[PDB]
Amino acid sequence: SIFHIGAFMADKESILVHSATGGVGLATLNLLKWKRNQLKKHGNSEIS
Amino acid sequence: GVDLILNTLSGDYLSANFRSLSQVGRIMDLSVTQLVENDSLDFSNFKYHVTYSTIDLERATTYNSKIVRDILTEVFDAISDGSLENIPVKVFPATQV
Amino acid sequence: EPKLLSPSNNYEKDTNNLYLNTNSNLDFSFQCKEKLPHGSVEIKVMSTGINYKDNLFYRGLLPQEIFTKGDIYSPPFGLECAGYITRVAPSGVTRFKVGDQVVGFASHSLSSLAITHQDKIVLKPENISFNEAAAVCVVYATSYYSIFHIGAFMADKESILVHSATGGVGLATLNLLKWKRNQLKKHGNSEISNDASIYATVGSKEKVDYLQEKYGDLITAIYNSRDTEYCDEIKQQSAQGGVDLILNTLSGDYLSANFRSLSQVGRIMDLSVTQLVENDSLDFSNFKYHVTYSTIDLERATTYNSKIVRDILTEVFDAISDGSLENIPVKVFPATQVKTAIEYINERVHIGKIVVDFENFEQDILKPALQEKENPIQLNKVKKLEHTCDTLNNTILITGQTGIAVHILKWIISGSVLNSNKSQQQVTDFIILSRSSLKWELENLINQTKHKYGDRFRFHYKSVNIADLNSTRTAIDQVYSSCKNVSPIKSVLHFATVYEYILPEDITQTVIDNTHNPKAVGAINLHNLSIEKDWKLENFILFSSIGAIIGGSKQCAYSSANLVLDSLSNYRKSIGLASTSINWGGLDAGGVAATDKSVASFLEGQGILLVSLSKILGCLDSVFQPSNSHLSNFMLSSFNIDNLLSSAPQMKRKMGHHLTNYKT
Amino acid sequence: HLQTSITPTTKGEFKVEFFIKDNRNSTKWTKTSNGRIGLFKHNPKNNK
Amino acid sequence: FYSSNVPSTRPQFIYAFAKFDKIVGNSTHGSLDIMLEDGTLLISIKNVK
Amino acid sequence: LDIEKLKSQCSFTTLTKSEVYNKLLLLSLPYGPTFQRVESCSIGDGCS
């Protein structure tokens, strides 16, 4: 529901996750952190 | 505004979620308040670029095990060095079902 | 005498500073070159496409909230540009240099010039014509956005139904699908399962023929767009009970059938305006399984993704080279058939994108207008971007503080702040004298200019009656006693005016005094002050009215005082220390004639009409030039000479030659 | 007392909701059925 | 409408504050908020055409 | 909402009833006494 349906971009867009403490919300936050770090390592450290 | 919302709340909050979107906003729903028929939105919320998508887990049950493969492989790889985790796993015995 | 008041520097007559543009009737008028915003590029248009929005604008069929450049009266005709780079921004552009050939988005691109940010145009490859380039951007861009990005479409595992395929977007979509299928085929992904089909609807039989003979293998089936049983038919034919995406273009009704014509993983892209009718709804019932209803309007590609345009262009001419991809039928039109093309897009009996060409623009359009507007009697209407108060350098004085005064002061200050490119023409100090105590409007203007520009200007409003030269001299000397930085007074304008209705039975001496002490005695006292103080006044303007010319109604004293102003201005003209008095009519904005319409109807019964503020400020700008200071006092109003002479007997001989119809 | 309400929804579309009560006394209605209909002319060339 | 702020007694005066936004075509967008004497918020309109 | 800072914000000038309603009459908006309610209107820089 994030990286496919919305074609989300973890470096140029913002996201509001409702009820983050729900399992899906925590999975979402972990996904975002992992994606940010992965973009950071590959010379795409720019996260505006 | 924001550019995407992973809605989980029910009913009321959707109409404010719509307003809480920037002009390129999108919305993902995980709820069943949608199935109440003859109860509707308004096209007013759809003025600029919006994308209202409902979700229920049947596409991955037909199309994309690739997402599962990638998340698993990269999740334990990224846990190895450590910048990624796995959500708190609370274990229960077979007798406490 | 229209040519009386000589033009001012606020004119724009440099032909290089000019560039043509289409008006609301597509006829070409003139504008000034714009001040380039940061990170923006100016492009000489060689080819421009036409959309449905252009036809709609031609008839003004949209509300103002959808206009991005201009409004209904000056619609942004044209949406693509294909031409050379004329001027880069002073800063913030690295993707371009002056001279390159570029294509992309630019608001109101139906002109010879088009300014737009760099994030909306990309380097047009130099082996395709500008005619094709102006016919490739919008259609393929919108298709590649609404298909391969929002839907995350997969050209090998899903099916798509494109409504009204013969529309430009539809043909771009089909071409995109064919190109994508071939591209996947070449790279070992030749598997395109039959569950991935392409249905498309059109409106007539001829369109069916064209699609059949062109894309025969690619299209699975075709249905008419004017009926809805295609909804049932798709589910019948489909092995998966529906389609997986729809590029909706139809309006209203068909949406609710489109929703049903979706498989469980369906998605929908809308290109319509039927959503904007508020309180009108879809239903949640259509949203049971995975659906994705996304509306589309081209502003994301105008902010984020020129990458789509770059990729489609490069791969489109590369794939045309060997040949498995095309470019939609590009119908060319000359620069003179702009009206014809705009009407022609409405016919729908064409196919493809309509593009106008501008390689004959210089000879067939431009130079005729060059040779025409050079007309000396044609007071050129080209307005520059700034004002310049040439005669106002050091100091000005204003009598009166309400009404017409504030608009004039606003305009003078707005001109003065831009006039800071000279070493002397910086207005330093305004002096305001009014019999009444301070009013809200003048104070509002004062504090607006304060809050806007700091201590650049300084107002010194000393309230004191103007009927005694001694008191006025005391006020001025106290102004020079308050701050030692007041520049010498250079100009004075008489706006002070008291309004009194006096029928020809109650005219007492006090009426004449109350009318003339603020107007005539005040003007004479100011003239004496300039005499004593050695004031070389380039601008000594007196505001008289048409009463001194044609005579007012039960307002004797006001008209007489205006005539004294005329006589005094002539006297100053003769003896040196030139001046000017102007007998205006009513005021369209900022007066009793502008607040109560009964007096407006009464005055229009005499034939006089209120003059818009634009012409008023034009006349002030003209008289603020040292070249025109030598012309005599003149009257400025818009008259209906017919009614004016029907009401005024004496003026039949003095102004009889102004009629256009001589009644028999 | 059965009362049907017709609500304009979109072009062609309409919304239908019903209610009942007891006539001489009841101010209380309770909706019993509802649905949506659409006034679109069909295609009778796939028929018989 | 913050009705939970409506007072039990009629005040002699209620304040207001309106911030202009912009003009498109011949239509003006404004905003308006109605406030009590001591700043309590009563009505907030974020768009007036 | 902070009254004092908004009063400081919007204090370019001050207008009585009559001036405001004449200005409104300039907008072709006549009004009877029953609709004359604005007492004091201090204008600012678009914030009033």
Q: Which of A2, A13, A16 to mutate to test the interface with B (most CBs of B within 10 A)?
A: A16
D40, two tokens: 């679109």
What are the CB-based long-range contacts (under 8 Å, 24+) for C408-415? C408/C493, C408/C495, C408/C617, C408/C620, C409/C442, C409/C445, C410/C445, C411/C387, C411/C617, C411/C620, C413/C449, C413/C453, C413/C457, C414/C387, C415/C386, C415/C387, C415/C388, C415/C389
Taking the Cβ of residue C295 and every Cβ of chain B, the question of whether any pair is shorter than 8 Å is answered with yes
Q: Is there a contact between C254 and D14 (Cβ–Cβ < 8 Å)?
A: no
Would you call F12 and C448 a contact, using CB atoms and an 8 Å cutoff?
yes
Q: Can you tell me the distance from the alpha carbon of A36 to that of B78, in angstroms, rounded to the nearest whole number? A: 12
B87, two tokens: 């959500």
3-state secondary structure of C418: helix
Half-sphere exposure (Cβ direction) of A29: Cα atoms closer than 13 Å? 13
CA distance to partner chain C, nearest, from residue F15 (Å):
6
Task: Using alpha carbons, select from C173, C216, C220 the residue that is nearest to residue C194.
Answer: C220
Within C274-391, strands assigned E span 292-295, 331-333, 354-357
Would you call A7 and C149 a contact, using CB atoms and an 8 Å cutoff?
yes
Q: Is there a contact between C640 and C651 (Cβ–Cβ < 8 Å)?
A: no
Resolution to one decimal, Å = 3.9
Taking the Cβ of residue D1 and every Cβ of chain B, the question of whether any pair is shorter than 8 Å is answered with no
Q: Is there a contact between C277 and B47 (Cβ–Cβ < 8 Å)?
A: no
CA distance to partner chain F, nearest, from residue E25 (Å):
17
CB atoms within 10 A of CB C345: 18
Taking the Cβ of residue E26 and every Cβ of chain C, the question of whether any pair is shorter than 8 Å is answered with yes
Q: Is there a contact between C640 and C608 (Cβ–Cβ < 8 Å)?
A: yes
Q: Is there a contact between C529 and C478 (Cβ–Cβ < 8 Å)?
A: no
DSSP letter at C2 equals: T
Backbone angles phi, psi at E20, to 5 degrees: -65, 150
Helix orientation angle between B66-81 and A23-41, rounded to the nearest 10 degrees:
70
Question: Which three-class secondary structure string do you get for B45-88?
Answer: HHCCCCEEEECCCCCCCCCCCHHHHHHHHHHHHHHHHCCCCCCC
A15, two tokens: 């996201």
Taking the Cβ of residue E45 and every Cβ of chain F, the question of whether any pair is shorter than 8 Å is answered with no
Work out the burial of residue C370: count CB atoms within 10 Å of its CB; fewer than 13 is exposed, 13-18 middle, 19 or more buried.
Answer: middle
CB atoms within 10 A of CB C533: 13
Binding-face residues of E in 13-42 toward F, CB within 8 A: 13, 15, 17-20, 33, 35, 38-39, 41
DSSP letter at C382 equals: -
Within C168-315, strands assigned E span 198-202, 221-224, 246-248, 268-270, 292-295
Query: What kind of experiment solved this structure?
Result: cryo-EM
Nearest residue of chain D to residue C251 (CA atoms): D11
Q: Can you tell me the distance from the alpha carbon of A17 to that of A25, in angstroms, rounded to the nearest whole number? A: 6
Q: Which of B3, B6, B9, B55 to mutate to test the interface with A (most CBs of A within 10 A)?
A: B6
Task: Using alpha carbons, select from C127, C125, C207, C217 the residue that is nearest to residue C164.
Answer: C207
Within C26-100, strands assigned E span 28-32, 40-50, 80-87
Taking the Cβ of residue C290 and every Cβ of chain B, the question of whether any pair is shorter than 8 Å is answered with yes
3-state secondary structure of C438: coil
Within C466-521, strands assigned E span 491-494
Amino acid identity for residue C545 in this structure = S
Q: Is there a contact between C469 and C525 (Cβ–Cβ < 8 Å)?
A: yes
Q: Can you tell me the distance from the alpha carbon of C100 to that of C106, in angstroms, rounded to the nearest whole number? A: 16
Half-sphere exposure (Cβ direction) of C458: Cα atoms closer than 13 Å? 14
Task: Using alpha carbons, select from C378, C383, C334, C386 the residue that is nearest to residue C360.
Answer: C334
- Chains with 3+ CB–CB pairs under 8 A to F are C, E
C209, two tokens: 């023929």
Radius of gyration in angstroms for the set of CA atoms belonging to chain B, rounded to a whole number: 18
| Torsion sign, CA atoms C271, C273, C276, C281 | negative
The residue written with tokens 């489909």 in the block is C238
Q: Can you tell me the distance from the alpha carbon of E47 to that of E22, in angstroms, rounded to the nearest whole number? A: 11
Amino acid identity for residue C344 in this structure = Y
Taking the Cβ of residue C152 and every Cβ of chain B, the question of whether any pair is shorter than 8 Å is answered with no
Q: Which of E13, E14, E17, E43 to mutate to test the interface with F (most CBs of F within 10 A)?
A: E17
CB atoms within 10 A of CB C400: 24
Radius of gyration in angstroms for the set of CA atoms belonging to chain E, rounded to a whole number: 13
Task: Give the total residue count for chain D.
Answer: 48
Specify the DSSP element, H or E, that contains C528: helix C522-533
Q: Is there a contact between C218 and C244 (Cβ–Cβ < 8 Å)?
A: no
| Torsion sign, CA atoms C328, C331, C335, C339 | negative
Would you call B5 and A14 a contact, using CB atoms and an 8 Å cutoff?
no
Q: Can you tell me the distance from the alpha carbon of B47 to that of E47, in angstroms, rounded to the nearest whole number? A: 15
Q: Can you tell me the distance from the alpha carbon of C634 to that of C652, in angstroms, rounded to the nearest whole number? A: 19
Q: Can you tell me the distance from the alpha carbon of A48 to that of A45, in angstroms, rounded to the nearest whole number? A: 9
Q: Can you tell me the distance from the alpha carbon of C169 to that of A45, in angstroms, rounded to the nearest whole number? A: 37
